[PDB]
Amino acid sequence: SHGSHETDEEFDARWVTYFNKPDIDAWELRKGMNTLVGYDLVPEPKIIDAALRACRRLNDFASAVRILEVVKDKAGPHKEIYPYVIQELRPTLNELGISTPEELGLDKV
Amino acid sequence: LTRFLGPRYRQLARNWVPTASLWGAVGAVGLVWATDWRLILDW
Amino acid sequence: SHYEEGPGKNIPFSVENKWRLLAMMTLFFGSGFAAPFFIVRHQLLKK
Amino acid sequence: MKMTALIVTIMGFMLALELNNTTYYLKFKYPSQTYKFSNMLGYYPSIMHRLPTYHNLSMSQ
Amino acid sequence: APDFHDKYGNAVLASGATFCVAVWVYMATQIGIEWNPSPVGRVTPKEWR
Amino acid sequence: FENRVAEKQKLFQEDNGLPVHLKGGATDNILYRVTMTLCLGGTLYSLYCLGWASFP
Amino acid sequence: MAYPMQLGFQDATSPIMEELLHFHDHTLMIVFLISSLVLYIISLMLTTKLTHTSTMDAQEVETIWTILPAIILILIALPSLRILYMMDEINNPSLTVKTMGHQWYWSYEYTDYEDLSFDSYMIPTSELKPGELRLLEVDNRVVLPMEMTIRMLVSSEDVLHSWAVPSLGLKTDAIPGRLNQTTLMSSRPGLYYGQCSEICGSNHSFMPIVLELVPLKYFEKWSASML
Amino acid sequence: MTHQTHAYHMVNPSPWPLTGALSALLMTSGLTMWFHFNSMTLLMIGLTTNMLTMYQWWRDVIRESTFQGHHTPAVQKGLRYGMILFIISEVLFFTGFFWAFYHSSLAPTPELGGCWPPTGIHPLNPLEVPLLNTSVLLASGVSITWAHHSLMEGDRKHMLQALFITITLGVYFTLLQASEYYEAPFTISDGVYGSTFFVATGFHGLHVIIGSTFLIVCFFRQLKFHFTSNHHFGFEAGAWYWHFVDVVWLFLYVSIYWWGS
Amino acid sequence: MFINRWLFSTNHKDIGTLYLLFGAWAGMVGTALSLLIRAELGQPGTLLGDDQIYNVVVTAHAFVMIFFMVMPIMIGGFGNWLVPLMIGAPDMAFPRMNNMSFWLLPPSFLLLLASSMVEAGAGTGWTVYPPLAGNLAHAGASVDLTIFSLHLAGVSSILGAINFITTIINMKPPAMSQYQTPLFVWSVMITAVLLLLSLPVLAAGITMLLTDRNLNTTFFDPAGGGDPILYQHLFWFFGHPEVYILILPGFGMISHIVTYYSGKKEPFGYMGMVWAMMSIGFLGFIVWAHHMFTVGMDVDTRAYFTSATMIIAIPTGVKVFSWLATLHGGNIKWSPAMMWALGFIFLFTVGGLTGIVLANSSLDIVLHDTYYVVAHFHYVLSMGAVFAIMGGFVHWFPLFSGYTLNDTWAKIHFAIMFVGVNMTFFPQHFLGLSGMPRRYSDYPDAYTMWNTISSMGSFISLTAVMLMVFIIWEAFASKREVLTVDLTTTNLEWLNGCPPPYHTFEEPTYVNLK
Amino acid sequence: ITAKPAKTPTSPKEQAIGLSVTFLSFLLPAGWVLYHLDNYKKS
Ligand code: HEA
Ligand code: HEA
Ligand SMILES: [Cu+2]
Ligand SMILES: [Cu+2]
Ligand SMILES: [Cu+2]
Ligand SMILES: [Mg+2]
Structure with missing residues (x-):
């Protein structure tokens, strides 16, 4: 823990594994995201994927949508980050039937 | 003397002070009319 | 403890009528701000 | 001197209108005494009519 | 549903911004305030004996 | 000597809904009022003196 | 003296006052650096949508920001201390004047040879002759020889007072029962004004100081005609 | 709740x-x-x-x-802290007075004769009564300790006996000091020496009286069996205060009575 | 009932409320006095009169703002209100004594008011230095009353200092170490220690001054062999710690406010922050003499004090930089309190930077007793201590009251006051470099411009403190009750709702011993 | 920080009143005393 630090690949893995736990409950799903968001990075598509799938396991559509919103917010002024993510998530988005916040029109005020 | 003093007696004393206290005020008023202090008159 | 609790009840002044309150705040802060002025006046009127 | 005639009017519209809009915000209240007074036409008819007329019409019988 | 600011924001900003600058310019000049700026460049020295 | 703290413990633990400074009887009460009276009066007297000394 | 709309120090009439101007410039340059650095960092911090609210490692950067201020303080301290000693330096004065603060006037005493002593009072704004400075003119100026090392000895005969003359970079409190010393050394002739720099009662603001510096020759004739 | x-x-x-x-x-x-x-x-x-x-x-x-x-254990631990802290603020109160004294005696102004003790002042002899007052205070230090030890050992009579001896020594010092004041050939008005002396030794004097009425209170609380062999903070404090008082006298003795005279 | 609750209290919350009420009112008096000061200096000439009536005003201004507004509010108000709530204590260690601390204040204030009424008041300066403060130059009851007011205020503050240290040390959850208490609590525990050690020396000093003028002693009278400078040492030995005692609780509130509105869990470098205040508190005890550079002391010692004074910049620096580091990755919320916190960070930096300049004895010779030093301390007090008070007040008001303030109005109030104080004190740097002395009712014609601008700014500030009173009224008139509070996981004070009940932590708090 | 709507809302008129009053209570007394300064300075 103290002084012990992981490489990026490990960090990601650690997260994919976390979100993939079959018996993951709503709490852990919230904890995981709420925690991941405190870091200085937009999560890798592969981490987002595992989280989107976990949402399906918990029959939670709305959280799956909010997860994508966070991904965009975290990119701050870096416009190019979100689209690339959505791009790598396209398969899962279609497979699971997940609508983007933009499609749902939640991106407007 | 000693017999009169008691732990129990205090409520009566408290009650007495008000009646006694009220009584004390009357004398000042009574004395004052006779006394006629200029300062008392000034009051 | 028969001490009432909740908003507007943990203070030594009534907050139930906004205008009575207005008056009270006015006298409170008002008398505080005026004091120095009247002290100076008092000092200016001595001899 | 000349401004006063205008400013008093302006105070009139501002106070009366903000008050009137404040009437528009729910919150039931019940009348104050001043309301009952000024809206009872000063009570004046209801006392100067129910009284002397009674003492006279009584007195006249 | 427009908030107090959506409707009044510009009105307040402008009228407020105007009133301020109006009244201060007056006080700063239209009355007898002695700012006593540096005489260098503005005052012509007179012999004092 | 004596040792009757046991009586007083009981007297003071008695659930009469009285504040400790009065839990002990009638004298507590007279002492209280005397103290309170002297303080307030004194305070009044002091204000008078200051009003008096404020003037030349 | 001070002119209208002045920003910095009065022009240096003596060398330590010059020395001070330069030190202040040095010190002020730094307060500008730091105070603008902080303002930049602040606006920087508040200008991004990017977040990182998780835990951040301190200590690491903590050395930079503890060693840097430490170096900067030496950069100020050194010059400061040098000037400090330079002021309390071994010099040999050719004259000794004494000044004694009094409740609402200063009195001077030139007593090396003869017992010359006078009172210096402020000229009531009412009796000022055109061109005279409102709260600064005194009736009897303290005359002294320009270009010479004078030793002033400040004391008071009542409450505390403080004898100061900014142009020469001087300020010494006047404490009853005490003889504080200071070295005056103007490098140019003229009239140099100062004011009581210590709260001393009702007319604290109305007990100024005016130094008039002329050449030795005129100094001594003045001194004699003074008794 | x-x-x-x-x-x-x-x-x-x-x-x-x-x-x-x-x-x-x-x-x-x-x-x-x-x-x-x-x-x-x-x-x-x-x-x-x-x-x-x-x-x-x-x-x-x-x-x-x-x-x-x-007064459960937690409540008591808090009272201990309070007392310590209070005694501390007191130690710093007396420090203003020793500062004053040393300031004056180490750099005597010319109006004094440029010396210490100032010309005209006839200081008391530390070896006379001041020496006595010292031994009295010090002895009450040992006797109050004996008292404390008897109390913890449940020895009612002895604690009472020691507390009594302690109290009388405190009174003896008060009287002795009182006479010294009266016989002193100098006064509060005798310049800085008198000021420095009478207010420092004076405030200390007030403290010996404050400490003695405290021990008296403790005496009676004991007569009434208030203290148990294990819970007697009222005494612990009275004792701590009493020591603060000897110690201040030791500094007074050495500084004002011996060194500065 | 009302009596029992408000006059016979033993409740940290109610005593704390009583303080805030006392401090706000005293704050009105001090503001009035500051306006008479600028009224007198806003045009060349004399408005009131001689430096006596004027300096009486300047003196009361200082005593009122220092001893009756700032200290009561920060230590007695926020101190009593928040400390027990932040460490999970049912109340304070000495509930009764705590009450005396408060009740000693109104009388103390009376004595100070009385002093300016009898005779010609005390025109001595807040430092009340002798011989001016003596029974010759200031005969009469005035100074004596000023002294007694100070005695009470001092007794009040060291009694409270005793309470806070005992509580803070002795009443935390058994599993919670000191390095687990919040910065604000640390901030007042340290301030409490400074009060305990400095206040008594002051009382020793003014008691000596009191005897010198009533009992014929000569502690500070050359005649008897005394020394007016001795008073300066004693006074200033307390006098410096006193200003840190004034900014420390402010440092704490700032740490809390910046962290909260940055959406962070904790402040950056918590232990560095604890180290910083401890260093500041300590160095603050060995630098008093920098207030006596033109008194005639040895060059060497004069050198010591300028150096010792300068090292205080280091720890203060780690704090400024830590608050910045705290804002770093934060999700900033531009709330009124955050606005006050940012202002403080900058303005306090400027004012303390300006104090490093004065730290130099050589330069201080020409800067001492001028308006430069008036600028220095108003920056650190008017836009340092005060900005913290406002940020803390607007931030915790809902906790104390249960009601919310109108944020927009609250923001307007910052805007006005920010302009006002800068316009008031900025020019004063010039007046001081250019030679305008302190404690003058009038000045040479040259200083007219800056003094004018300066006085105008003080009127804007007046406008702001008037608006604030209203802002409080409206809050109480509308009655929007608090519903939800953010980040309570890391902010205990809010866990019992707004306002917390008379009795909080009746049943302790559970904290595991890992 | 969220809150319920005002139990007793303060309409603009109401605010304008409280703001005016708050100002007067500060400005009047001082203004009066200041207005008569000269009378005091001349007894
Ligand atoms: C809360 C109030 C407060 C605070 C915190 C301070 C803080 C400081 N003050 Fe003080 N000061 C006053 C209020 C205050 N002061 C008052 C009331 C007076 C006048 C009393 C009277 O005589 O009537 C006064 C007077 C005064 C004097 C004497 C003036 C004279 O009469 O001749 C001096 C001189 O040393 C001084 C210095 C300092 C210093 C060095 C600090 C330091 O604490 C400053 C520290 C802050 C910083 C240094 C900035 C932040 C740090 C960094 C960004 C690190 C990097 C910077 C550098 C490397 C420089 N002050
Ligand atoms: C707390 C410290 C404090 C504060 C905040 C201020 C604020 C003000 N002071 Fe200062 N002042 C001193 C302490 C303070 N002062 C001291 C110690 C001296 C030295 C005296 C001496 O020389 O002996 C001095 C001296 C002094 C002088 C120099 C006089 C001279 O030497 O000739 C001047 C002149 O301009 C002045 C002006 C002002 C002004 C214009 C304000 C304005 O900024 C005031 C603005 C109003 C406020 C900021 C108060 C509003 C805050 C509240 C009312 C709290 C409300 C409560 C709640 C929210 C619950 N002050
Ligand atoms: Cu003077
Ligand atoms: Cu003066
Ligand atoms: Cu200082
Ligand atoms: Mg000075």
């Missing part, structure tokens, strides 16, 4: 803080009357309400601890 589950003490509303605050007003403004418009009536009333307040405030504290049992 309703019933507390922490070991602390929730003290009942007391009028005493108000009463003691008012007292401070009366004594301060009362001193101002005495000093200026030559009157003590106000000062008298203040001293009165003040004693009244202290008596009652401390009476209650006794009630709450001995009779009501609110």
Whole structure:
């Protein structure tokens, strides 16, 4: 823990594994995201994927949508980050039937 | 003397002070009319 | 403890009528701000 | 001197209108005494009519 | 549903911004305030004996 | 000597809904009022003196 | 003296006052650096949508920001201390004047040879002759020889007072029962004004100081005609 | 909730803080009357309400601890801290006076004769009564300790005996010091030497009286079996205060009575 | 009932409320006095009169703002209100004594008011230095009353200092170490220690001054062999710690406010922050003499004090930089309190930077007793201590009251006051470099411009403190009750709702011993 | 920080009143005393 630090690949893995736990409950799903968001990075598509799938396991559509919103917010002024993510998530988005916040029109005020 | 003093007696004393206290005020008023202090008159 | 609790009840002044309150705040802060002025006046009127 | 005639009017519209809009915000209240007074036409008819007329019409019988 | 600011924001900003600058310019000049700026460049020295 | 703290413990633990400074009887009460009276009066007297000394 | 709309120090009439101007410039340059650095960092911090609210490692950067201020303080301290000693330096004065603060006037005493002593009072704004400075003119100026090392000895005969003359970079409190010393050394002739720099009662603001510096020759004739 | 589950003490509303605050007003403004418009009536009333307040405030504290049992271990540990801290503020109070003294005696102004003790002052002899006062205070230090030890060993008679001896030595010092004042060939008005001497040794004197009435209070609390072999903070404090008092005298002796004279 | 609750209290919350009420009112008096000061200096000439009536005003201004507004509010108000709530204590260690601390204040204030009424008041300066403060140059009851007011205020503050240290040390959850308490609590525990050690020396000093003028002693009288400088040492030995005692609780509130509105869990470098205040508190005890550079002391010692004074910049620096580091990755919320916190960070930096300049004895010779030093301390007090008070007040108001303030109005209030104080004190740097002395009722014609601008700014500030009173009224008139509070996981004070009940932590708090 | 709507809302008119009053209470007394300064300075 103290002084012990992981490489990026490990960090990601650690997260994919976390979100993939079959018996993951709503709490852990919230904890995981709420925690991941405190870091200085937009999560890798592969981490987002595992989280989107976990949402399906918990029959939670709305959280799956909010997860994508966070991904965009975290990119701050870096416009190019979100689209690339959505791009790598396209398969899962279609497979699971997940609508983007933009499609749902939640991106407007 | 000693017999009169008691732990129990205090409520009566408290009650007495008000009646006694009220009584004390009357004398000042009574004395004052006779006394006629200029300062008392000034009051 | 028969001490009432909740908003507007943990203070030594009534907050139930906004205008009575207005008056009270006015006298409170008002008398505080005026004091120095009247002290100076008092000092200016001595001899 | 000349401004006063205008400013008093302006105070009139501002106070009366903000008050009137404040009437528009729910919150039931019940009348104050001043309301009952000024809206009872000063009570004046209801006392100067129910009284002397009674003492006279009584007195006249 | 427009908030107090959506409707009044510009009105307040402008009228407020105007009133301020109006009244201060007056006080700063239209009355007898002695700012006593540096005489260098503005005052012509007179012999004092 | 004596040792009757046991009586007083009981007297003071008695659930009469009285504040400790009065839990002990009638004298507590007279002492209280005397103290309170002297303080307030004194305070009044002091204000008078200051009003008096404020003037030349 | 001070002119209208002045920003910095009065022009240096003596060398330590010059020395001070330069030190202040040095010190002020730094307060500008730091105070603008902080303002930049602040606006920087508040200008991004990017977040990182998780835990951040301190200590690491903590050395930079503890060693840097430490170096900067030496950069100020050194010059400061040098000037400090330079002021309390071994010099040999050719004259000794004494000044004694009094409740609402200063009195001077030139007593090396003869017992010359006078009172210096402020000229009531009412009796000022055109061109005279409102709260600064005194009736009897303290005359002294320009270009010479004078030793002033400040004391008071009542409450505390403080004898100061900014142009020469001087300020010494006047404490009853005490003889504080200071070295005056103007490098140019003229009239140099100062004011009581210590709260001393009702007319604290109305007990100024005016130094008039002329050449030795005129100094001594003045001194004699003074008794 | 309703019933507390922490070991602390929730003290009942007391009028005493108000009463003691008012007292401070009366004594301060009362001193101002005495000093200026030559009157003590106000000062008298203040001293009165003040004693009244202290008596009652401390009476209650006794009630709450001995009779009501609110002084659990946690509550006591807090009282220890309070006392230590208080004694500390006192140590720093006396420090203003030793500063004053040393300032004057180490750099004597010419108006004094440029020396110390100033010309005209005839200092007392440290080897006479000052030496006596010293031995008296020091002995009460050993006797108050004996008292403390008897108490912890449940020896009622002895604790009482030692506490008594201690108290009389404190009184003996008070009288002795009182006579010294009266026989002293100098006064508060004798310049800085007299100022420096009478206010430092004087404030200390006041403290010996304050410490003695404290030990007296302890004496009676013991006669009444208030103290148990294990819970007697009232005594621990009285004891700590009493030591603070010897120590201050040791510095006074060495500094003012010996060195500065 | 009302009596029992409000006059016979033993409740940390109610005593704390009583303080805030006392401090706000005293704050009105001090503001009035500051306006008479600028009224007198806003046009060349004399408005009131001689430096006596004027300096009486300047003196009361200082005593009122220092001893009756700032200290009561920060230590007695926020101190009593928040400390127990932040460490999970049912109340304070000495509930009764705590009350006396408060009640000693109104009388103390009376004595100070009385002093300016009898005779010609005390025109001595807040430092009340002798011989001016003596029974010759200032005969009469005035100074004596000023002294007694100070005695009470001192007794009040060291009694409270005793309470806070005992509580803070002795009443935390058994598993919670000191390095687990919040910065604000640390901030007041340290301030409490400074009060305990400095206040007594002051009382020793003014008691000596009191005897010198009523009992014929000569501690500070050359005649008897005394020394007016001795008073300066004693006074200033307390006098410096006193200003840190004034900014420390402010440092704490700032740490809390910046962290909260940055959406962070904890402040950056918590232990560095604890170290910083401890260093500041300590160095603050060995630098008093920098207030006596033109008094005639040895060059060497004069050198010591300028150096010792300068090292205080280091720890203060780690704090400024830590608050910045705290804002770093934060999700900033531009709330009124955050606005006050940012202002403080900058303005306090400027004012303390300006104090490093004065730290130099050589330069201080020409800067001492001028308006430069008036600028220094108003920056650190008017836009340092005060900005913290406002940020803390607007931030915790809902906790104390249960009601919310109108944020927009609250923001308007910051805007006005920010302009006002800068316009008031900025020019004063010039007046001081250019030679305008302190404690003058009038000045040479040259200083007219800056003094004018300066006085105008003080009127804007007046406007702001008037608006604030209203802002408080409206809050209480509308009655929007608090519903939800953010980040309570890391902010205990809010866990019992707004307002917390009379009795909080009746049943302790559970904290595991890992 | 969220809150319920005002139990007793303060309409603009109401605010304008409280703001005016708040100002007067500060400005009047001072203004009066200041207005008569000269009378005091001349007895
Ligand atoms: C809360 C109030 C407060 C605070 C915190 C301070 C803080 C400081 N003050 Fe003080 N000061 C006053 C209020 C205050 N002061 C008052 C009331 C007076 C006048 C009393 C009277 O005589 O009537 C006064 C007077 C005064 C004097 C004497 C003036 C004279 O009469 O001749 C001096 C001189 O040393 C001084 C210095 C300092 C210093 C060095 C600090 C330091 O604490 C400053 C520290 C802050 C910083 C240094 C900035 C932040 C740090 C960094 C960004 C690190 C990097 C910077 C550098 C490397 C420089 N002050
Ligand atoms: C707390 C410290 C404090 C504060 C905040 C201020 C604020 C003000 N002071 Fe200062 N002042 C001193 C302490 C303070 N002062 C001291 C110590 C001296 C030295 C005296 C001496 O020389 O002996 C001095 C001296 C002094 C002088 C120099 C006089 C001279 O030497 O000739 C001047 C002149 O301009 C002045 C002006 C002002 C002004 C214009 C304000 C304005 O900024 C005031 C603005 C108003 C406020 C900021 C108060 C509003 C805050 C509240 C009312 C709290 C409300 C409560 C709640 C929210 C619950 N002050
Ligand atoms: Cu003077
Ligand atoms: Cu002066
Ligand atoms: Cu200092
Ligand atoms: Mg000075």
